[PDB]
Design a protein around this ligand. Structure first.
Ligand SMILES: Cc1ncc(COP(=O)(O)O)c(CN[C@@H](CCC(=O)O)C(=O)O)c1O
Ligand SMILES: Cc1ncc(COP(=O)(O)O)c(CN)c1O
Ligand SMILES: O=C(O)CCC(=O)C(=O)O
Lengths: 424, 423
């Protein structure tokens, strides 16, 4: 019997039962935080050597470029080739920038707004209405960019195999629709991964805008919790094979590989998109930081060296995800109140509670000293129309803290659920 | 006697002889380049240690920030404080970014275009026309930004004490005029420096646009050729004192101090302007590279450490400028065909040849295997109305290459001048 099927008296009694547990939780005086989607100090210690790279006297890229001096908008060959080898794409596809792929995403959108992109009839700023497809739950920092530009964000469901392509294929037939966000591997926060079939559909679909763009933000391209590395779909190639070569603006970075905020970002896109991008980037400045790129190339040495680092991250993160999953199972399984993802990579667990109660869960957790990301944080304009979803970030705290925190979260889920069904 | 005073016969003899020298110059099959203000490899060697910084286990800013992890839009206190001490301004003024100050200049203009700035009634995108004041000769990369945005660029002279303030103060009465570029110390390329009097005028002037900005791009703030450091006007403080606190967007960087393209940039501006900037920069991302900032703070230690580095730069650069000047003096002075700047600092010499002949000089030089910046490159849209100015960049080549290259340039100046007078 799930809580929702409890009779009026049994849910009342269940409410009194669980409230006693919530009282016990508050008497612990906790100060715990499950909101930080960032690496732990242990993980950051793995790249300690990179703080001393590339090192005295070592300042030449593989083509002879003196990385210490001005020039070159594309990034250095050394790091571009490593990433090409890692991702299994031609090196010509890869541009290496500064430490933020979000910076590049914002820029390409900004420039499409000001100038148009290379396929634009006119700049997006001339449009009365720009719409933008948002698979949900999704990444708040993506949705913030499109909200700051005033684009009308239209949500679609992020499914186990990727965005709902029936919904996307329909929405792109509207010429107001200029692009979409996706995190295609271990998606933030669902953990879901775009299948080959879904990528093919994104690559082959017809769009009403001539200048429509998919942001394929492959932020977790190698970020497994297991021994297996996920498939890297060559999405730019698929777009090329389908006759839509310019469709995909693809990104990734080293921010959760080396140093979070001081890594290297990558922008993978078609020949014509790269010329457009570097033509605008060359007015914005002289080019990206080559020294940090050489440092990175030296640290990894080759693509296998990147995978070796990713196995260390996996070994550090796995027990944290396992604790969270173990607690959710032991406390909530019998009650039918919640569903949670079981991800095999990435940085998050996505928790759906009773619809109408997510904001109350986070409020109760706060009263109990446990910080949860707010209700709607994974939705455009922070509006989850079912008030059900919560994002859990296991990476930073030690396992002992995750145990305590999640035990409390689970009590909060139950109490909120008991309040909700008792109020019917 | 100047070349213009030679009679037909004498200028014909001079022309044949300089033409022969030019032919002899081309026969050398040179491949030399005076176009880019890049530090030499000798200069870059000075920061060899920075390639190993901040070093293993050293990753906390002075306020405890772990520089290896996300967050913080302002840059770390360690580097901000050193720059504040260096420039003699309150640390609160200083924001520290990534490796390019141009990126930030681009960004603040693009955001003013898109969103408006904090003093704007509406985005500049909604204006029929945006005008922008450009002191000349000036910096090509500044002008390129405002060209790319469609802004109509209005030239004013860059004089020895700064921009022509009689002209600026008149132009700013037009509300279409939204801002201005300046390089205020050892200016690119004139070497000229804004005086306190001119700075005060810029701070007090009345503008018709409510959201007018001066870009005060102090790229050469400490970049002495003589070991005497120039005055650092606290320009943000002067705008605040005049009652126009938001007027100045000030910049500098370490690109010609440490590593060119892998240094640290700074943005100095008012409290309201910083809040506006970081508001937008926080949507563009999570914030700048804190590790490189700590590396820089470790490398310099303090303001005196920055000044020690600058003295090393001066020792490397000054004989290159001196050689250029010696060649200009010995080849050109007697002929009255050219004028050039004699800078106390910065990265360039500004050369004015016979009006109507600069593009010819650059074409002759290119035929001879010597790359010069094109005619008009220090002017908006590359339009020098007198076709007289050329910029020379002594920093990159060794003195031996400078000597060969500049002897060649002088022969080009003289041939172009001889052709002009003979026609
Ligand atoms: C006035 C000025 N401001 C900024 C810069 C560069 O600032 P950064 O963006 O912080 O590095 C400069 C320098 N210009 C040189 C660069 C050489 C190159 O080949 O790229 C030039 O173009 O010659 C100046 O002058
Ligand atoms: C999907 C996604 N994309 C981009 C980023 C940030 O990338 P960067 O640090 O290179 O800006 C993050 C950080 N969590 C993320 O989850
Ligand atoms: O920790 C931060 O400042 C934001 C990090 C973030 O967006 C993420 O890693 O998902």
């Amino acid at each position: 019997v799930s809580l929702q099927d409890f009779d009026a008296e049994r849910i009342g009694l269940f409410h009194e039962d669980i409230k006693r547990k919530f009282d016990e939780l508050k008497s612990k005086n906790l100060k715990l935080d499950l909101t930080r989607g960032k690496p732990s100090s242990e993980q950051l210690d793995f790249a300690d050597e990179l703080l001393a790279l590339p090192g005295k006297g070592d300042f030449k890229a593989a083509d002879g470029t003196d990385v210490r001096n001005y020039g070159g908008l594309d990034g250095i060959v050394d790091i571009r080739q490593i990433w090409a080898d890692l991702l299994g794409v031609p090196v010509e596809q890869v541009l290496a920038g500064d430490a933020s792929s979000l910076n590049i995403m914002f820029d390409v959108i900004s420039w499409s707004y000001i100038f148009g992109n290379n396929d634009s009839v006119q700049p997006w700023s001339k449009e009365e209405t720009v719409k933008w497809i948002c698979p949900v739950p999704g990444y708040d920092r993506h949705f913030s960019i499109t909200e700051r530009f005033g684009f009308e964000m239209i949500s679609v469901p992020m499914n186990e195999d990727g965005p709902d392509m029936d919904a996307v294929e329909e929405l792109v037939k509207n010429p107001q629709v200029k692009g979409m966000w996706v995190v295609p591997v271990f998606s933030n926060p669902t953990g879901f991964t775009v299948t080959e079939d879904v990528a093919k559909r994104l690559s082959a679909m017809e769009t009403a805008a001539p200048d429509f763009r998919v942001v394929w933000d492959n932020a977790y391209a190698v970020h497994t919790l297991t021994d297996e590395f996920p498939e890297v779909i060559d999405i730019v190639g698929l777009g090329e094979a389908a006759g839509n070569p310019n469709r995909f603006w693809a990104f990734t970075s080293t921010s959760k590989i080396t140093l979070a905020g001081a890594g290297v970002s990558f922008f993978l896109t078609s020949a014509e998109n790269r010329k457009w991008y570097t033509g605008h980037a060359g007015i914005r400045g002289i080019g990206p930081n080559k020294v940090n790129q050489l440092a990175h190339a030296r640290y990894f040495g080759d693509a296998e060296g990147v995978r070796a680092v990713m196995r260390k991250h996996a070994a550090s993160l796995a027990p944290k995800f396992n604790k969270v999953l173990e607690i959710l199972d032991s406390r909530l399984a019998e009650y039918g109140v919640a569903q949670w993802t079981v991800p095999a990579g990435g940085y998050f667990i996505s928790l759906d509670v009773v619809p109408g109660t997510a904001s109350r869960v986070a409020e109760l957790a706060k009263e109990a000293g446990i910080a949860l990301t707010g209700a709607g944080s994974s939705y455009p304009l922070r509006q989850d129309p079912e008030n059900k979803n919560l994002r859990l970030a296991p990476s930073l705290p030690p396992v002992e803290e995750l145990e305590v925190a999640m035990d409390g979260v689970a009590t909060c889920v139950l109490l909120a659920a008991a309040e909700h069904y008792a109020n019917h």
